[PDB]
Ligand binder design. Structure first.
Ligand SMILES: OC[C@H]1O[C@H](O[C@H]2O[C@H](CO)[C@@H](O)[C@H](O)[C@H]2O)[C@H](O)[C@@H](O)[C@@H]1O
Ligand SMILES: OC[C@H]1O[C@H](O[C@H]2O[C@H](CO)[C@@H](O)[C@H](O)[C@H]2O)[C@H](O)[C@@H](O)[C@@H]1O
Ligand SMILES: OC[C@H]1O[C@H](O[C@H]2O[C@H](CO)[C@@H](O)[C@H](O)[C@H]2O)[C@H](O)[C@@H](O)[C@@H]1O
Lengths: 421, 421, 421
């Protein structure tokens, strides 16, 4: 049996008092992780090549993820069965070296480690013909599936509260990768088309986005004994809310009291990302990000986000280092024009099985300091029925109440292990 | 560690619109599976021979099953811990070659693959002395356990709503197998006696069946490089509802509003089954079923079911084939005499690790067409309290409302992998 | 992958009727297990040495526990993700042979097998520097974490119902072990300091214990080809309720109707334990316990417990034996001075992979007899709001109702497998 996975677990404390806390800017879709992760998370993969004959094989792979608060020993939880697929490589003579698969599978996900941000990820139940050699590059075709909690109506209402049927979205993906635009540089282009797929006779709310597009171009350049990726993505309508390749064509959300509420996503997103890891010498490794993401919604409730951070590792020993992370966010409300921002600085002493900034397991002992000043937040007071501004961006002091994390500080510290295998 | 299991996962679509749908006749206890399975289902077994000394060994085996809707990636679920037993072979000199076991175990289950129908399955927590060599055959003894949600009362009421205590049924199984009635043919006989086992001072409803019998005779004949099994089972009373060897001696069911309702099973069942897989040549494999099951209840709410289907596989290549399935059901209501029926036809193109119709993993791309015309259904409107006909068979148009799937059509299609290992 | 664990599963019956029942004295924190365990319980560990270089290694270990009623096959359950840690041995030159770890880990738990009683167990999320060679012995340092369901208030109330915030306790452990006080004897000393760790601005109820101490001294003496441990522990205040090393500094409990209720633990506990396993000859093994535990609470609701039992195994064969267990409990209510007591006698025939009373797997067929006579119980009638005596010890016949198990008998029997691997 092949045993792989990912896991992170630890203990921590907040300077002001109590268990460790984590800091994410309101409106940002990520946090700089080093010394800022507050759960035990683990994926346990057990797979196996079940049949080989020469070039041909069938591999079976699975994934069972667990998330717990790590505030206690016995922590019951509903695990998420995330992968259960079969890949058959070289089963087609005419298209050599290509694999056909089916089943739930984490499919080719691009992400930015330090901020734990997946920026291209259409995984889920699906099927596809992967790595077709096309000469100048490798072509891949897939179709995955997601489903929104409700958003579909059995009959025509004018009442949004009537749209409570789970609504299935489909994504059709096409990628062309490994094209050598230049020396040391490769170029990948992908196109995603997602659409809400309605049952016979069901309807989406009036004005619902229905479908959309995600367009990706990633360029990897080999540098300083590491790499650097430069991405530019542009999504449209139903692809703007999730913003990684998954569709939400219905536009209806539900409050905690089961009330439907219209969160239309007609609009667009433009994401320009650059990240990488570069070694410099024998004592320095450094991971780094820079992003600018702008979701512009027709309903004025978008956001314009900017991040930047660096994680330079300095190696005292082939197995002992001192890692430090510094991240900055700033999100501006599309609706109000206000701005939330934060800066985090973590200083960690780690021991890892390896001399890389990518080597895992790592056992860290760290201290984190975050200072924010947020001038807006989302109104989630009341209920989708009591509240008409439910879910809208709103200034910090709106109607006397308060929104957002405020203008403050905090520092935490602890020990944690992280590992992929 | 020994890693085994079963799993099926895939993506699909319904012709009319939306996610793929599955077709089962109302009253039938099964559906023809090819291109008609709508969930990711998986059992992950991890076992291990923990001690061997010569002929003697102790094997530990476990099973954790997961069922998810496969409409999304992250799908939290409560897994069912199904197996955790220990088998000690050859630990008894006097009864050589025999195994003693204890623990929850899937115990010797007979089933019919294409319709996924288990017809003899008493698995659950249990214990037993297995494979005792008796000369003409091998004798096996077991005792397993099931428990009904309620159906037992702490005191004597006349009110069924008072019978809400979980009620334990016990099954005592005895099988004699591997007797060579003829050349190429073996014969197995089994006898099951199940009884509801009441706590001191508890009572079952008046007229409750309490106990029952299941009697099985299976004959396996080696044929056309495959086999053919011919079964005849006859159950009695408390064994008629589940109809695979498990007892339900209490007769009380509960609606979704926690209301008890009397579903007495005094009566009998007669099941006559014939199924098998036969190869013909080097290009054809064919799986096939034929069944007639009649549950005759004292309360007139039984059913008389007939199925027939065939799954002929034609092999283009040692690893690529074209499988096709055609199934037919017809269930007649014992209460009303009406009839629900359906015919399914699936056409699939698969790639499998093997040249058999039994070879797994298989990766399929299929299209299914089902056409039904049901003239009855069960009344589950209202609640066991509002409704007096709750749970009874009732004609399609009963009291102006409607029951059953109607008279219709639909076609689906998709890709799916299936595998046992 | 390394596959380890623990599991027990079986089938049983109660003499009087129905499924098997288990007998524990009211007020006792344990039951003599042989032939007195009523669930399938299993921990499935999958770990792996992920990196070794000479003396240095990093081991990853995990644990997923399942508990089910074993009254049926399909038993859905929320598994408890209990372990997910990484241990790095020999990563520090200055402190050779020592390990540093982080993650949720079952950390050095002392327990008494036949009664399944852990008497020193601070496991949970944590971190630490283990096995530091100190010359005369090995010094270990750890910090683990627990959290109480509520017990903390966001503001100052005088209303206990206001204290519903989860409250984190921290434990700081220090042990010095393997000191050879004598020939064949070792001595371990540990000191635990636990404190409720409040968020900025939160408050605990007035009079809440807040913190406490656990002090342990265990002495292991090698004897009769086995051992004998003699423990003496003394805890204080917040460490008296759990009584194994974990803190509960808040003092608030909640009824099933979400009502807070004050269960202050200011006071102390004195536990004097002696247990062991000794072989005598080639046919006799015998496990044995003797304990006296006194929790004296300031609020008069403590208890004074005494147990004694022996499990002598007589070996007919290297793989077949006859085990028998005899246990006795007696708990006196601190509040009322009454006494609950019981005596259990189990007689089992087992087959195990080994000639030891410690050899697993074991497959048992047993019969148990328990006879109790309890004269007090806890009042859990009503709700923390209806009831003012909620949770207090109270005589059997208090206010006409009844408390405790009564004065009775019962006998059970069944088959069960148990195994650690
Ligand atoms: O599959 C590995 C990652 O899974 C989880 O990530 C989820 O949560 C993220 C935001 O918190 C999403 O961006 C992502 O799409 C989700 O799958 C897990 O929380 C991560 O830590 C894992 O690396
Ligand atoms: O254990 C393997 C099978 O388990 C499940 O079967 C359950 O559901 C069937 C009806 O849908 C019952 O006949 C059977 O008794 C149940 O155990 C699973 O759904 C099957 O696909 C598996 O092959
Ligand atoms: O981790 C192995 C043991 O875990 C469980 O024990 C829990 O329940 C005990 C009381 O019933 C507590 O003393 C203990 O702290 C808990 O962890 C399990 O029920 C045991 O059988 C296992 O051996």
């Amino acid at each position: 049996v092949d045993f792989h996975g990912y896991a992170r677990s630890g203990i921590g404390w907040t300077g002001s008092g109590g268990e460790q806390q984590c800091f994410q800017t309101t409106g940002a879709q990520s946090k700089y992780r080093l010394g800022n992760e507050c759960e035990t998370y683990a994926e346990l993969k057990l797979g196996q090549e079940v049949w080989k004959e020469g070039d041909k094989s069938f591999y079976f792979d699975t994934n069972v993820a667990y998330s717990v608060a790590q505030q206690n020993d016995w922590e019951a939880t509903d695990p998420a069965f995330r992968e259960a697929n079969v890949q058959g490589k070289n089963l087609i003579e005419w298209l050599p070296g290509s694999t056909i698969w089916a089943g739930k599978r984490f499919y080719q996900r691009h992400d930015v480690h330090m901020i734990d941000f997946y920026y291209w990820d259409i995984s889920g139940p699906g099927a596809g013909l992967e790595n077709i050699d096309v000469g100048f590059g490798k072509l891949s075709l897939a179709a995955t599936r997601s489903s929104e909690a409700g958003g579909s109506s059995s009959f025509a209402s004018n009442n949004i509260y009537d749209y409570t049927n789970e609504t299935a979205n489909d994504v059709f993906d096409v990628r062309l990768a490994q094209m050598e635009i230049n020396p040391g540089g490769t170029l990948e282009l992908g196109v995603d088309y997602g659409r809400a797929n309605l049952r016979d006779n069901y309807r989406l709310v009036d004005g619902a986005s229905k479908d959309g597009w995600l367009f990706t171009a990633e360029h990897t350049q080999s540098v300083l004994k590491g790499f650097n990726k430069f991405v530019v993505q542009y999504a449209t309508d139903s692809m703007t809310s999730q913003g990684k390749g998954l569709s939400q064509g219905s536009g209806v959300a539900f409050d905690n009291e089961k009330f439907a509420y219209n969160i239309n996503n007609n609009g667009h997103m433009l994401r320009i990302l650059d990240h990488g890891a570069i070694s410099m010498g024998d004592n320095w490794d450094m991971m780094y990000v820079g992003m600018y993401q702008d979701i512009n919604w027709d309903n004025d409730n978008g956001t314009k986000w900017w991040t930047v951070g660096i994680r330079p590792m300095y190696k005292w020993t082939p197995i002992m280092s001192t890692v430090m992370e510094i991240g900055y966010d700033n999100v501006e409300s599309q609706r109000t024009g206000d701005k939330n921002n934060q800066y985090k600085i973590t200083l960690a002493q780690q021991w890892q099985a390896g001399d890389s900034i990518w080597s895992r397991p790592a056992i860290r002992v760290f201290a984190t300091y975050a200072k924010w000043d947020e001038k807006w937040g989302y109104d989630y007071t009341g209920n989708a029925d009591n509240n008409a501004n439910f879910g809208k961006a709103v200034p910090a002091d709106f109607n006397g109440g308060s929104f957002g994390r405020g203008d403050s500080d905090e520092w935490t510290f602890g020990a944690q292990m992280e590992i992929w295998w």
